[PDB]
Symmetry: C3
Subunit: 187 residues, 3 copies
């Protein structure tokens, strides 16, 4: 009732492709295929998350509770200082909604029409709570997506976007760049 | 436990479903309440952190993705074959009156509430997009797709795509899947 | 496959600052720092709930499944007959989104700009499913917010609000206060 994280010792036994230091991962998260999951330094992953398939997270990243990263074979990668608020989903693959294909894991591949492509969250990206990131997009450096937003296309750097699907509403301030440098120097 | 969280077939048998078919993959991390009123057909996968509570009937060739709640209550939620539900969806067969005419929820005796109930049926080939909510007494017509983050309070016409809160019809669903279903069952 | 609630024996082992009678808490919920968590009578908290930090719940309240109450230091408080539909998040603190500050628990405080403020849900508040309430917000007595709502500012009493962010759409009926009084009167005589 203080925390649910793995000890450093249990972390080493998971079998991650790579795992940094100061990594706090909830025992109530699910991790599938850990040998294609890579995690940098100073990363917290909270209860009821799902990481499945190829996922790469850098350093100084919080993946908050309920967040699903479905990396599949193509991968999701997050750069340093990116953070995801609770209940986000990032899909690297999704079925065709149009009616031109059967759907999902109970059906053989030949009848489906999966949209897939690597998803990247660049440095300083923040994803607002209850958001969905669809496949084959890059969320630009310093981009903020508001809560309950839906993204289907790559997003231009250093803007804040809101809505379903998102629209640009204003520039993201770049003082965090200054602070990153100040912070890193301080160490 | 880093490959999958599903029950073995011998484990499923011990849950005590009204009926459960073959090639059924149900996460040990999902919750299942009143399994004696739940039935599940063949080739079904239900993922981590789902909840199925009360009367839920699922056919064959269906994925209920992670975090989905199917609150069937006493009236029931029914999905037909080839229906699927994306992550984080909720389907309610019963909900409390929000007007201010009634008290609300499970801590309150029934005489003070005014629960709206009605079966929710998803017909063949329905797909429900992620983070959606379906409310009681709604028939989601054959082949309907509902987009992500959509809210459905009324029945939806067959073979159309709907989006928004609450949903609006935006374009017809293609029906190539009907051929595909036939070609796939014919392969078997 | 009947229910996931802690027995009364298990509950007493949790360590709440205060917990009342007829408290039904899912063992599949997460409770962090129960020492600052107070719960009244006739409360139900479902599977995959998270309660973390300073949370005070009154009586006749259902916290439905997936709901997360991040009370932090400043606290989240719910008055009696308040209820929260599934998959809501209530934040008593959040990071600055603007780009003026670094973010999240991996960064020291001096580089962040956290907004914080007590969040209060008054009597008879209902929060629709899949909603978010932000910090420093008082949800007025009898307020309903609809499904998928986002609330960043305090809400005036006895109205229904919907949308992201919410707008006031209609009055909420007050018959519920007459029912509260009827209900409580029957418990007494
Ligand atoms: S990690 C903990 C989780 N934190 C969060 O999820 C925080 C998310 N914050 C937000 O979604 C904010 O609302 C942001 C995106 C930061 C915008 O806040 P601002 O204060 O910068 O802007 P306004 O509130 O003035 O709104 C600007 C226009 O955008 C609409 N809008 C704001 N937020 C959203 C969301 N999330 N979804 C849809 N629309 C949103 C406002 O209605 C406003 O629209 P106009 O058309 O200009 O009125
Ligand atoms: S099972 C794993 C999870 N998969 C999903 O949740 C997939 C959900 N897919 C979608 O929500 C798509 O956006 C769908 C519904 C398939 C629509 O995509 P289309 O490519 O057919 O259409 P457009 O992107 O051109 O959009 C048409 C109009 O509808 C608005 N819109 C699209 N999607 C939504 C949602 N989910 N919610 C509200 N509105 C939505 C677009 O803004 C566009 O609007 P106009 O007003 O016509 O410009
Ligand atoms: S605890 C179990 C979970 N229960 C719930 O989440 C129930 C939530 N209920 C709702 O969200 C209802 O839609 C409420 C808010 C009670 C409104 O229902 P009403 O029947 O009173 O109102 P209408 O359907 O006539 O809608 C009024 C206007 O509001 C728009 N709207 C309704 N609901 C929403 C939500 N959730 N989000 C955004 N907008 C919403 C309708 O489109 C309508 O708009 P107009 O511009 O007036 O047409
Ligand atoms: C959400 C969640 C929390 N926890 C545990 C570990 C966390 O350290 C603890 C608190 O997490 P939280 O997200 O509720 O709060 P945090 O946002 O970490 O903030 C906390 O630490 C800060 C440095 C202080 N400034 C805050 O006042 C204190 O609330 O609970 C888990 O173990 N798993 C979880 O999923
Ligand atoms: C989401 C989830 C996943 N898992 C386990 C079992 C799954 O078989 C495995 C991966 O599931 P997933 O949803 O991440 O991915 P799937 O949609 O099953 O897809 C995967 O298999 C396919 C046949 C291949 N075509 C894909 O490239 C590979 O990603 O993880 C669970 O045990 N429980 C879960 O809730
Ligand atoms: C959502 C959830 C349910 N459960 C268990 C406990 C509950 O008694 C049971 C059913 O809960 P539910 O939320 O599906 O349904 P309820 O809203 O409790 O409704 C039901 O029970 C009432 C006493 C009756 N008055 C109703 O007619 C019957 O449908 O499942 C859990 O143990 N944990 C959970 O998170
Ligand atoms: Cl969730």
């Amino acid at each position: 009732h203080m925390n649910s994280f793995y000890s450093q010792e249990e972390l080493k036994k998971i079998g991650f492709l790579s795992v940094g230091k100061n990594v706090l991962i909830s025992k109530k998260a699910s991790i599938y295929n850990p040998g294609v999951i890579s995690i940098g330094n100073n990363v917290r992953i909270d209860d009821f998350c799902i990481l499945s398939g190829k996922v790469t997270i850098g350093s100084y990243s919080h993946i908050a509770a309920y967040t699903a990263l479905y990396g599949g074979e193509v991968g999701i990668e997050m750069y340093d200082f990116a953070n995801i608020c609770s209940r986000t989903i990032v899909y690297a693959a999704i079925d065709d909604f149009s009616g031109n294909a059967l759907m999902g894991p109970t059906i053989p591949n030949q009848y489906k029409n999966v949209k897939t492509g690597k998803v990247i969250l660049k440095k300083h990206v923040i994803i607002g709570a209850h958001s969905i990131i669809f496949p084959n997009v890059v969320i630009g450096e310093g981009v903020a997506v508001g809560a309950m937003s839906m993204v289907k296309e790559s997003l231009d750097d250093w803007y804040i976007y809101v809505g379903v699907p998102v629209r640009k509403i204003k520039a993201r301030k770049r003082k965090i760049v200054e602070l990153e440098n100040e912070f890193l120097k301080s160490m």
